[PDB]
Amino acid sequence: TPVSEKQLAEVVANTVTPLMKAQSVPGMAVAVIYQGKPHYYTFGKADIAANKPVTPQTLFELGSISKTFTGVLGGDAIARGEISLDDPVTRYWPQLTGKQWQGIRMLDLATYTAGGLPLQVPDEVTDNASLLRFYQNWQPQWKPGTTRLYANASIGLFGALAVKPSGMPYEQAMTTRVLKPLKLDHTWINVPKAEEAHYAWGYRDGKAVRAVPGMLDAQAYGVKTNVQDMANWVMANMAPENVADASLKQGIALAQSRYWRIGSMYQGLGWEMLNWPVEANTVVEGSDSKVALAPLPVAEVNPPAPPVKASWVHKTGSTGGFGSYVAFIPEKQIGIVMLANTSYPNPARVEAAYHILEALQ
């Protein structure tokens, strides 16, 4: 169904406007990838009190969508020959001597199958000495490679260890190996003073808020970006054949590979996938925290299945004051980015995105 630019504009507006009013969303930046190019639509305010509108230059906090960058950076390191997903975690952290770590691979850290690592690294951890103490003391509730339990303590460590062989700190490795080659020049972990004027304000219970530190925060949920950079990020991931950097294109393919199957979903590195075609209720009913935070049994995909073009590839992300979502279908070469300055229900994000993409397929 060939939709015109005019009809596309109407499809987006008619879906986004009622959503924002029902969910009390202050502002939203949307990007739709259709017929080889990005289409931008901006709504509302970035700063309500100052009355600043949302523009394609407005910066939003990505939340867990930051994990897709971690997965690709890790994939790039594997493609360079620096690390292997089959290597034990201890190969990259010798001081981690606890015997409970035997059998736990880099793959397990990256895909939340280490055996029960908790959602977050505790507040007590304020340095590297205490970080080690935490992982050394941890006792697995399940055997490695049997149970998926979404955790920042898991993927966060994967990201920190994956960049060790390069000799660069995580931020520097991400900039040099992923951001720069893709020309994502307005994507930050640390927003410079010159860019603070573009930084949107997040809202929670009417209160204006913005992200604060941690330890493995950059690896798990510390990325800030505008809708233009995000659209290009989605384009590189849905069409890696067009990226020149050889290790990066392979890294993108590795992040979308299928390592485990959990019911109707498949776990990649950062990215999560479902076979296309898929109905909305399957995708929507899967985005509920009750199911998203639960420890679920996994089915090993061995060897890992390469990227399947007929897939619904996506990732949700939130912070105290922001709610974002990204979804794309490679077979159709269509995708969408929805960045907002309020954390509204994930099922609502999925429903809206599915509605828009359904009109383009």
Swiss-Prot record:
Q: Which domain of life is it from?
A: Bacteria
Keywords in alphabetical order:
Antibiotic resistance, Hydrolase, Periplasm, Signal
* Effect on the protein upon substituting T342K: In strain: MHN1
Per UniProt, what does mutating L132V do? In strain: Q980R
Which Cys-Cys disulphide bridges does the record give? none
Q: Which Pfam families match?
A: Beta-lactamase (PF00144)
User: Further remark, if any?
Assistant: The sequence shown is that of strain P99. The class C beta-lactamase family has a specific amino-acid numbering system known as SANC, for structural alignment-based numbering of class C beta-lactamases, or else the simpler name structural position. A multiple sequence alignment was used to derive a consensus sequence and then the consensus was numbered taking into account insertions and deletions. This allows use of identical numbers, e.g. for active site residues, despite differences in protein length.
Subcellular location(s): the record lists:
Periplasm
Impact noted for substituting N242K: In strain: MHN1
Q: Effect of altering P38S?
A: In strain: MHN1
Q: What are the protein's GO molecular function terms? A: beta-lactamase activity
Q: What is this protein called?
A: Beta-lactamase
Q: Which organism is it from?
A: Enterobacter cloacae
What PANTHER family does this protein map onto? BETA-LACTAMASE-RELATED, D-ALANYL-D-ALANINE-CARBOXYPEPTIDASE/ENDOPEPTIDASE AMPH
Enzyme Commission identifier(s)? 3.5.2.6
PROSITE patterns the record matches: BETA_LACTAMASE_C (PS00336)
**Gene3D superfamilies linked to this entry:** DD-peptidase/beta-lactamase superfamily
Record: active site: S64 (acyl-ester intermediate), Y150 (proton acceptor)
Tell me the residue numbers annotated for binding substrate: K315, T316, G317
Similarity annotation: Belongs to the class-C beta-lactamase family.
| BP terms from Gene Ontology | antibiotic catabolic process; response to antibiotic
The protein's matches in InterPro entries, at most eight in alphabetical order, are given as: Bact_CellWall_Synth/Modif, Beta-lactam-related, Beta-lactam/transpept-like, Beta-lactam_class-C_AS
Q: What class of enzyme is it?
A: hydrolase
Per the record, its GO cellular-component terms are: outer membrane-bounded periplasmic space
Which reaction is this enzyme known to catalyze? a beta-lactam + H2O = a substituted beta-amino acid
User: In UniProt terms, what function does this protein have?
Assistant: This protein is a serine beta-lactamase with a substrate specificity for cephalosporins.
